[PDB]
Amino acid sequence: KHDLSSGSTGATFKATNTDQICVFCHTPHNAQQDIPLWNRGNPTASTFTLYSSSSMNNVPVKQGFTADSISLFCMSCHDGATGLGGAVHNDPNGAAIAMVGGNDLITGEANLGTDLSNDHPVNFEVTPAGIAADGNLGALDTGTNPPTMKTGDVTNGLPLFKSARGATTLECGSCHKVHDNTDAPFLRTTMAGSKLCLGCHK
Amino acid sequence: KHDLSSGSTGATFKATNTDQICVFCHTPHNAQQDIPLWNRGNPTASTFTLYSSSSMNNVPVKQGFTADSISLFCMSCHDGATGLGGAVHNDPNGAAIAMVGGNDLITGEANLGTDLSNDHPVNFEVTPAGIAADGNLGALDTGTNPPTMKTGDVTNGLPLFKSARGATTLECGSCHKVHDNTDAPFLRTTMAGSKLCLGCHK
Amino acid sequence: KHDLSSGSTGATFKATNTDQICVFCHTPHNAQQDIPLWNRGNPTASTFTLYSSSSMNNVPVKQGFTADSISLFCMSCHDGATGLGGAVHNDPNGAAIAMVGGNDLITGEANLGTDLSNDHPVNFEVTPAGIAADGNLGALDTGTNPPTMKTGDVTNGLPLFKSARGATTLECGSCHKVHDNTDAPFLRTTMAGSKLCLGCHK
Amino acid sequence: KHDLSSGSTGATFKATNTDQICVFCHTPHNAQQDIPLWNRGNPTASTFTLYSSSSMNNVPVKQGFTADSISLFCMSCHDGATGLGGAVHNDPNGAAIAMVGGNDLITGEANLGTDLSNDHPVNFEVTPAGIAADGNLGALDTGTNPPTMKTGDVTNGLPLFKSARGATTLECGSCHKVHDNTDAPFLRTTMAGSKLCLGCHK
Amino acid sequence: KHDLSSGSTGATFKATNTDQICVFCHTPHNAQQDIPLWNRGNPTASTFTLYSSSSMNNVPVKQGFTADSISLFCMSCHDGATGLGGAVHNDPNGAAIAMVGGNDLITGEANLGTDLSNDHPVNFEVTPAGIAADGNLGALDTGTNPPTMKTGDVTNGLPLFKSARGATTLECGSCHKVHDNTDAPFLRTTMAGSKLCLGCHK
Amino acid sequence: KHDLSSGSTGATFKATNTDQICVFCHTPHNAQQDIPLWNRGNPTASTFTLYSSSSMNNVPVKQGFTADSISLFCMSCHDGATGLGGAVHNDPNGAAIAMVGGNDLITGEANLGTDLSNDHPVNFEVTPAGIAADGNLGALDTGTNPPTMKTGDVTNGLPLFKSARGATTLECGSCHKVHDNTDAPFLRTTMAGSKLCLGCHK
Amino acid sequence: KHDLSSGSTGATFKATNTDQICVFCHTPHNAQQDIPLWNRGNPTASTFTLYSSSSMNNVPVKQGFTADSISLFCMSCHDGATGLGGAVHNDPNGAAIAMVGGNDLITGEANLGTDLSNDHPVNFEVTPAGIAADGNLGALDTGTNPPTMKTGDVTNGLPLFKSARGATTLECGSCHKVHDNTDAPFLRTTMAGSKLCLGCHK
Ligand code: HEC
Ligand code: HEC
Ligand code: HEC
Ligand code: HEC
Ligand code: HEC
């Protein structure tokens, strides 16, 4: 899916003036941030809302992302308003990347918009006190890099990410693995059987 | 019972084109409401009647549910008219969920229909004035989330739910716990001994 | 007395395959009538006769009960012909309730049979004209729910019930309170001293 | 006088194991006859003789009472041979009623025995032909319930009772009112002045 | 005259502790004899003599009355030796009847004493043979109750009474009617004109 | 003649305050003597003389009557000195009997006075020896009551009376019958023809 | 002859308004003298002369009768001047006795007139001295009542009468017996044979 090459066969949206996989994401030189080789323009965090209800631990952090949130990286192409090709910084041929059909914005069901009223919670620090209060959020392992949240049925658990809210924070990349399409839509494991879901919500 | 997986052993009705527990109830993205990850189509409240007699406190609210009533969520599959698989919004494989035998409607004794003339009252605000008038509806605790109605014989009491009629409202989920089948048919405690019944009707 | 649990200590007749107080009387769902949660099979009213003499106001109504008479509910187990356990509708374990000794019918002095030639009158509308004609049937209060017949010596009087013959009708429950055994055999007050009798027959 | 309660102050004979006025006469359930709530054992009529002389209209009926005579009810405790407490049918506490001193039989002047050679005539049908023959037995009124024998000096006359000999029959209750002690020994009017006697024997 | 009530106006002797006409003569219960409701003490017959001369039919019966003679009843208060109030058996208030002035014995001209040497003959059987022998004692009628002695000038004749000497016996009540004072001193007809005397002595 | 009623038509002397025949002679109660019901005051016998001559049998008895002589009864009103109305003992209305004209004494030819020098002999015992001596005084019959003196021409003879002088004594009533006026002046038979005179003086 | 009844057959003079023998001579009451029952008017004795000659003993008594002479009684109707019916005192019917023909005076040979110059001597005392002087006047008997003069040939002699001249006096009745007509004209014995005459004049 994320093979945006012109010669790709399974890509819904692909360029027409380049053949490279990685220019859409990674540039060897002249990148944006010291988070691996990011060459994509990201929006502001002030225009994003998250899931909030009186059953969680994220009440004060229900508005806005952080400046170092990977969820920002994902929504940079998964917001429905940022150009797929027009947001590049280090373009591959000195000009704007040509897009097929002229639709430089993601559409369809994959579009997420700007409101997360219908999405799984992201960018909040899972805490051992919160886990004890709920009593069902598995366990924590700190000896691994990155630290993972222990599960009673899945090997290696789910990776966690460091953010402003804390060093053990759930994120857009917790479930989705961008590069590996072994279990589409790039889930960390094949979802049939609910075994990934049972990893956390036991 | 509510394990609608194809590989389930104790489910009366199960799908044949999926293996996931939660797609029938919860979808990670593109949900219906900001009430936890609801992916089920609910009917209108105008076609529902409730228990009403000259011994209660719910005389003006004996017709119709609210738009935010959990009882609506439960009757969405427990009405006897809404499709068990056809009412999903975010389907798991891009098509309608296949049902065994083709009976996409609940039948048997578990069917409740649309008339509650033979059911325990639901969706009404229990009030301290009403409790004092009756003199037997236990007591109230507001320091817990959700607020519970105190009982003289059962630990932790019964949870209450917030609705349009009020913040302390009895509901379909007051007695039934959807996920925990420790005491089937998903009662909050084992019913033998009438100890749950004695919790309120002392 | 009416604690029909298997673990009960003072019950003459008790079940052996259940432990619940209320299944014998009340079922949460799938009840019989919109009169509180009735799960007991009642007989026909055409086979019942009542007390009749040329000193009362019930001459035309000396034969048969009404379809909404609480006396029917009481005689449903107090007729001497209806099964104590076999008349349930919503059984607690999917089968007929097991009875100790196999005697599913009430016996002894408590048995009332089908003829009320030796019983206090029931199911007739007490009227202010009739009270004035007799001149001793206390007085009437309509501001209370249910309306009561005023007594000159007892606080709160006797409750009355609504029926087909009228809205102020004496009934089996007028003297007997089914749940409260403070004054056995479930009388509304302790009978020693004839103070209950003096409440009406002054 | 007829207040046989243990706490009574003016009763010659009173019980010691009960406090109720009416168990001695009336039981709510399980009575003897369809004549109001009779719970007292009555003797046979074959052992009773009546006043008979060649000046009356009761020559063929001078021996024995009827099975439905109220005089039998009165003599059930006013015969001098039937137990005051031992003749109850529906006892108040599951055992024989305890009597003070052990004298369960009425004694003294109030005792009447079994021979009415010294008593006013009872249980005979007064007839208009007989009244015309004597010419002094007042008049008859049939529009009242029960029918009364008209008197020229007393309001409302004397009530009459229905029996086997006829529908207008003098009886033990014609002069004596069991419940009202306004004019002791329970006469229908105060006897001073002979006005009751002048009501009939003008 | 015989109205012995305390409120009487024409009575020479009256009581002061009662107001009843009939207690002096009749008691409803506990009477003396089976001759109508007699409550007066009578003297012995051995102390009485009668009119005797060689012109009548009563030679062998000139000494003593019978045990069933009404003349005994009359002399019970008309002997001059028996107490007017002290001879009662069933007293009206549990004590001796109080008499005005303390003179409980009849005095004056009305007093008759114990010797009938100056009185009209009583208590002897008038016989048809005796009537034929005298030839002036009217005639006899047996079809009436009581049998009367026919007179040629007076309607209905004189009533006769049954006694030991015979069934057609003259008696104290033959001329005197105790209750009817239409013709004082309680004669059966007004005596002016000798028409009563001419009824027998033609 | 002897009908002294006020309404009488043939009576020379009659009362004005009474209507009774017999009060002048007979009173039912309180009479004077045991000689039938005498209510008239009689004079003394010492003031009476009789017929005496040397041809009879009454020489020693020619002065004075006896205390039991009927002639005394007759002269009680036939002496000319005793009051006709003032000599009553048992008066009919509590007062002296009123007489017409005020003449309470008999006058005229019927007056006899106190001397019998001009009258037929009375009050002497006729004896069989005396009859044999005279040889004309009929015969004697003792089997009749009263004994009569036999006559050869008149049926039933003349009645005789008992007195102190003897049991067969002539008397004022021998010829005169007081009640029967068939042959006035109350003779025992019609005197025309001298047949009564020939009965004795043959 | 002396049967003066109206129905008489042998009487020359008889009444027409009466039928009685004795009213002409004897009245029961109201007579004239104490000489037996005389009811006839007698004349004076001064107008009568008697037989007188110088051969007797009656020289000084030859003029006039005595006031007590029976000869006066006889001449009262045998004088020829006194009325036969008009001289009665006690008349039988309140009026003068009617006489046949109107001749109330005796006539014919039986008339004696007023002069006894032709009659046998009367009313003089026969004396024993006079009898001795004459020597033929029988003898005297004093033991009989009345005293008689003894005769030598006739049984019982002649009765004598008492008068003023003496106790043994001849009289009109000496020979004549007024009542007995055995030997007419009422002689004491049949005169044929002169045996009566020979009784005295021997
Ligand atoms: C972080 C902000 C994100 C973003 C941008 C997306 N996800 Fe998820 N996702 C999860 C599961 C189980 C599915 C399968 C969908 C299904 O079974 O119906 C998905 C799918 C997607 C899609 C495409 C399919 C779709 O239905 O939209 C997209 C574009 C997408 N995701 C974006 C699970 C998780 C999860 C843990 C349960 C987390 C955290 C996220 N997703 C986070 C994100
Ligand atoms: C809210 C609208 C609901 C719905 C949809 C159901 N219930 Fe209840 N329930 C209660 C108890 C004690 C039982 C046991 C039944 C028994 O003992 O016989 C049940 C059972 C059910 C069933 C299945 C079994 C059946 O008999 O129908 C179903 C499908 C069901 N429930 C649906 C008690 C309560 C209660 C408090 C007393 C409340 C509130 C509810 N239930 C509410 C609901
Ligand atoms: C309505 C049809 C009923 C029924 C089914 C029963 N009752 Fe009554 N009850 C009353 C009183 C004073 C007693 C005490 C008995 C006593 O003192 O001896 C009772 C008792 C009973 C019993 C059990 C004991 C018994 O003696 O039978 C039963 C089974 C019973 N009742 C059934 C009084 C009343 C009353 C007002 C006076 C009325 C109405 C009823 N009862 C009605 C009924
Ligand atoms: C029907 C069989 C009965 C019975 C059992 C009794 N009575 Fe009478 N009663 C009447 C009157 C006027 C009195 C007063 C007594 C008085 O004045 O002296 C009574 C009294 C009694 C008593 C108690 C007192 C006593 O003297 O015995 C008793 C126990 C009693 N009664 C029993 C009048 C009548 C009457 C109409 C005149 C009739 C009918 C009855 N009584 C009937 C009965
Ligand atoms: C039966 C033993 C009796 C008794 C006790 C009494 N009588 Fe008579 N009575 C009769 C008449 C005609 C009178 C009127 C009196 C009169 O006219 O003077 C009476 C009166 C009385 C009285 C009171 C008045 C008085 O003079 O004493 C009394 C107390 C009395 N009686 C008592 C007639 C008869 C009669 C038939 C002729 C008979 C029988 C009786 N009486 C009997 C009795």
Ligand code: HEC
């Ligand atoms: C007893 C002492 C008496 C009394 C008081 C009276 N009598 Fe006589 N009597 C007799 C006869 C034949 C008559 C008729 C008179 C006549 O024919 O003229 C009478 C009449 C009377 C009267 C009234 C008429 C009169 O002439 O005086 C009276 C008042 C009277 N009597 C009173 C006959 C007898 C007789 C037998 C011959 C005897 C005895 C008596 N009487 C006795 C008495």
Ligand code: HEC
């Ligand atoms: C006394 C004064 C008298 C009276 C009035 C009468 N007598 Fe005599 N009498 C006597 C005898 C023997 C005869 C028979 C005459 C004869 O035989 O012829 C009579 C008759 C009469 C009559 C009628 C006949 C007549 O011849 O007149 C009358 C009227 C009469 N008497 C009147 C005898 C005596 C005698 C003794 C001898 C005495 C005395 C009397 N009589 C006296 C009287």
Ligand code: HEC
């Ligand atoms: C859009 C998404 C792309 C595309 C089209 C490519 N890459 Fe990647 N890549 C992407 C992200 C968001 C990250 C970092 C994720 C994280 O830090 O959690 C990366 C990272 C890499 C890395 C180093 C990290 C590792 O190896 O685990 C490499 C070597 C890499 N990417 C290679 C790569 C190549 C060869 C591509 C085309 C042939 C290519 N990427 C495309 C996001 C995206």
Ligand code: HEC
């Ligand atoms: C139908 C009912 C289902 C089924 C088949 C599953 N879930 Fe649940 N779930 C359901 C409801 C009505 C609710 C909310 C109830 C309320 O708000 O009172 C939930 C909630 C959850 C949650 C979060 C709430 C909590 O944990 O207390 C989780 C983590 C969850 N559900 C998980 C889950 C999984 C893992 C399932 C398959 C393995 C699954 N659900 C099925 C209703 C239903």
Ligand code: HEC
């Ligand atoms: C047979 C009788 C039973 C038994 C064994 C139980 N209940 Fe009751 N109950 C019964 C009747 C006939 C009625 C209605 C009476 C009327 O309407 O007049 C009820 C009512 C109730 C109620 C609500 C009415 C109220 O509270 O006043 C409750 C809460 C209730 N019953 C509870 C209850 C429980 C907890 C029992 C076992 C622990 C139980 N009942 C048994 C009749 C009968």
Ligand code: HEC
């Ligand atoms: C012995 C007598 C008693 C006693 C101790 C009580 N009652 Fe009565 N009662 C009795 C009789 C013989 C009758 C019927 C008489 C008839 O039918 O002529 C009654 C009747 C009643 C009635 C209904 C008739 C009415 O009201 O007129 C009542 C309501 C009643 N009795 C009440 C009552 C009470 C309350 C008593 C004790 C507090 C009581 N009775 C005692 C005889 C006798």
Ligand code: HEC
């Ligand atoms: C003394 C005498 C009294 C008095 C003061 C009263 N009564 Fe009478 N009564 C009396 C006698 C001797 C008799 C019987 C006479 C007989 O048998 O010949 C009676 C009879 C009655 C009767 C029934 C006989 C009838 O009616 O013919 C009655 C109804 C009656 N008595 C009534 C009565 C009343 C009402 C009195 C006071 C108001 C009363 N009596 C006084 C004697 C005497």
Ligand code: HEC
């Ligand atoms: C004055 C004389 C009178 C009057 C006015 C009445 N009677 Fe008589 N009565 C009288 C006497 C002297 C005697 C007795 C005579 C004797 O013993 O020889 C009587 C007797 C009676 C008798 C009974 C004797 C019988 O019947 O033979 C009766 C019944 C009688 N009397 C009745 C009576 C009546 C009814 C009178 C008025 C209607 C009446 N008498 C008046 C004297 C006198």
Ligand code: HEC
């Ligand atoms: C005229 C003479 C008469 C008549 C018509 C009658 N009697 Fe006589 N009677 C007469 C006299 C003068 C005397 C007395 C004579 C004397 O005393 O000597 C008498 C006497 C009697 C007597 C009594 C004397 C006796 O019996 O001896 C009687 C009983 C008598 N009379 C009866 C009587 C009768 C019955 C008459 C009519 C039937 C009658 N008398 C007529 C004179 C005269």
